[PDB]
Scaffold this active site. Structure first.
Site, PDB file in Angstrom:
ATOM      1  N   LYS A   1       0.938  -1.035   0.059  1.00 26.03           N
ATOM      2  CA  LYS A   1       0.061   0.155   0.064  1.00 26.03           C
ATOM      3  C   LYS A   1       0.843   1.218   0.088  1.00 26.03           C
ATOM      4  CE  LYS A   1      -3.905   2.253   2.389  1.00 26.03           C
ATOM      5  NZ  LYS A   1      -5.108   1.825   3.477  1.00 26.03           N
TER       6      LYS A   1
ATOM      7  N   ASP B   1     -10.664   2.026   4.950  1.00 23.74           N
ATOM      8  CA  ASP B   1     -10.625   2.306   3.565  1.00 23.74           C
ATOM      9  C   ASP B   1     -11.057   0.654   3.214  1.00 23.74           C
ATOM     10  OD1 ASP B   1      -9.787   2.826   1.215  1.00 23.74           O
ATOM     11  OD2 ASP B   1      -7.621   3.128   1.417  1.00 23.74           O
TER      12      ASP B   1
END
EC number: 2.7.11.1
Length: 294
Positions: A40, A139
């Site tokens: 990420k 998220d």
């Protein structure tokens, strides 16, 4: 020694998996071993680099859960002027791609209710673990739920992106999975919202599995960010879905978060609890993935 390392020669990004709300998710590869990873990538102002490390260290213990991609490491790619430095969060890799990759490679762009239930419970297990230990994810979206080769479900990130938005006031991506209370930012502080936002996001992700895309997908991001707090909560369009599924959505997607059920409430929802044995469905999902083209 208080610093995060540059990934050069350790890890390389291979392919974008998803462009989440608070960062981008890549398939990465260890240069030396060739071992694959989920990385990420998040912009960081760099003013707080040590703070990030501290947060990561505080949070990484919570990644060892079976439904959260396990922390491998963390790197800060210092970039030239005009370019912000980037935090690389490195986690275990998942071969079957994303729930989103699955939806699109499925004929009709629609998952069987059983699959939605299985995946929904796996996401909710991970979320349960995080909320249990006071961590918000913030998220949750199909692109951020990876599937292994054995059709295990793993969440990408475990609160790191959510701690940056706190430490470094963020300045994002598509808002379709964002809960009303997160957009209104009525109480930014810690913005725990009793850990309800992730549940709404789970709702949207469920609809995403059902309908191919989140509600409001066809609309400009800004219009949706405008509408989400103002419009009634989305519902499934089709009546083909069970009353359980529709109830689940009705629970996940309550607008007033104080009236939204809590994580462990949602865990005991018929759509989640009263569902076939886990391994049972996992198999059906697994071989399906195998046939799909990536």
């Amino acid at each position: 020694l208080s610093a995060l390392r540059d990934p050069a020669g350790i890890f390389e990004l291979v392919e974008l998996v998803g462009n989440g709300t608070y960062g981008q998710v890549y398939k990465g590869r260890h240069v030396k071993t060739g071992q694959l990873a989920a990385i990420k990538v998040m912009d960081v102002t760099g003013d707080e680099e040590e703070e990030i490390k501290q947060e990561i260290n505080m949070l990484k213990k919570y990644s060892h859960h079976r439904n959260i991609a396990t922390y491998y490491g963390a790197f800060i790619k210092k970039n030239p002027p005009g370019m912000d430095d980037q935090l690389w969060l490195v986690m275990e890799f998942c071969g079957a791609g994303s729930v989103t990759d699955l939806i699109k490679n499925t004929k009709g762009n629609t998952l069987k209710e059983e699959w939605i239930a299985y995946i929904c419970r796996e996401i909710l297990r991970g979320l349960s673990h995080l909320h249990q230990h006071k961590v918000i994810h913030r998220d949750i979206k199909g692109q951020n739920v990876l599937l292994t080769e054995n059709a295990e479900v793993k969440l990408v990130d475990f609160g790191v992106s959510a701690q940056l938005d706190r430490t470094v006031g963020r300045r994002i991506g598509t808002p379709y999975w964002m809960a009303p209370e997160v957009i209104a930012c009525d109480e930014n502080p810690d913005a725990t919202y009793d850990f309800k936002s992730d549940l709404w996001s789970l709702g949207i992700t469920a609809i995403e599995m059902a309908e191919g895309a989140p509600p409001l997908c066809d609309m400009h991001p800004m219009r949706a960010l405008f509408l989400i707090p103002r419009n009634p909560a989305p519902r499934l369009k089709s009546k083909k879905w069970s009353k359980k599924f529709q109830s689940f959505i009705e629970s996940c997607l309550v607008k007033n978060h104080s009236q939204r059920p809590a994580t462990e409430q949602l865990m005991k929802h018929p759509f989640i609890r009263d569902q076939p044995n886990e391994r049972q469905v996992r198999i059906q999902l697994k071989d399906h993935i195998d046939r799909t083209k990536k």
